[PDB]
Amino acid sequence: MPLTSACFNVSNLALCGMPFLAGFYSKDMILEIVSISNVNMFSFFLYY
């Protein structure tokens, strides 16, 4: 399956946050909003 293999790639990269895919648009913006807002040690370290 090169189609299913390729499609499973797209899901991985969207979920893996490879740039300019779904994760990158979403996971990114969250993580620096964590940086911007004052937060707790574990909450910070744990997200990363």
């Binding site: 797209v10 969207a14 893996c16 946050g17 895919l21 779904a22 648009y25 979403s26 990114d28 913006m29 993580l31 620096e32 909003i33 940086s35 911007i36 990363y48």
Partner: protein, 48 residues
Amino acid sequence: IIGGSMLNWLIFPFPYMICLPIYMKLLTLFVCIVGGLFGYLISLSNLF
């Protein structure tokens, strides 16, 4: 594949401005990458 783009351009009338240290914004990429290193390394094992 287009993913968040359509939303990202149509959900945030007031995009959150985030000017962070370089050692934080980029850190989101490498603390991310070391996981994949481990995920594809710890799996790859020599027989003995």
